[PDB]
Amino acid sequence: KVFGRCELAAAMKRHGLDNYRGYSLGNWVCAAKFESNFNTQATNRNTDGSTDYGILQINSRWWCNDGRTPGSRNLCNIPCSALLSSDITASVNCAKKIVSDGNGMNAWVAWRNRCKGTDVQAWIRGCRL
Numbered sequence: 001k002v003f004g005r006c007e008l009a010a011a012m013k014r015h016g017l018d019n020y021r022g023y024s025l026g027n028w029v030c031a032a033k034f035e036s037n038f039n040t041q042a043t044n045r046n047t048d049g050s051t052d053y054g055i056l057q058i059n060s061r062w063w064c065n066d067g068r069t070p071g072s073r074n075l076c077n078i079p080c081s082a083l084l085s086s087d088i089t090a091s092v093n094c095a096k097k098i099v100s101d102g103n104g105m106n107a108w109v110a111w112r113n114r115c116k117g118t119d120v121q122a123w124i125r126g127c128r129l
């Protein structure tokens with residue numbers, strides 16, 4: 001599914017991301033834009049042979065099982081395929097664990113490089129929520 005901007009903002013707020021670990025909703029929307037273009041089916045292979053999955057490009061190196069990332073962990077206790085669903089529940093639940101792991105949203109290098117320190121409220125401007 002490719003979400004609209006405000007549609008995704010809504011969905012993320014319903015699933016409890018607004019101000020989760022102190023990160024306003026616009027931070028989450030900005031990260032999803034640059035990670036996936038709001039496409040739940042996004043995947044990208046990393047250099048090490050891990051894969052990033054879904055709207056927030058969650059990495060099989062640590063967070064999910066895809067059976068093809070030697071040595072990796074599955075800390076969210078899910079198949080990586082769950083992160084590609086039209087329903088963002090699994091992605092959100094796993095993101096809450098990631099953002100809680102000490103580095104905050106710096107876990108997402110694209111957030112650090114493209115969202116952090118910008119006017120992230122622009123991503124939810126106009127949205128009914």
Ligand SMILES: OCCc1ccccc1
Binds near residue numbers: 043045046
């Ligand atoms: O942008 C990297 C590409 C990628 C996506 C899914 C599986 C392998 C590769």
Ligand SMILES: [Cl-]
Binds near residue numbers: 024121
């Ligand atoms: Cl915001």
Ligand SMILES: [Cl-]
Binds near residue numbers: 066067068069070071
């Ligand atoms: Cl594996």
Ligand SMILES: [Cl-]
Binds near residue numbers: 021022103104105
């Ligand atoms: Cl933090």
Ligand code: NA
Binds near residue numbers: 060062069073
């Ligand atoms: Na894994």
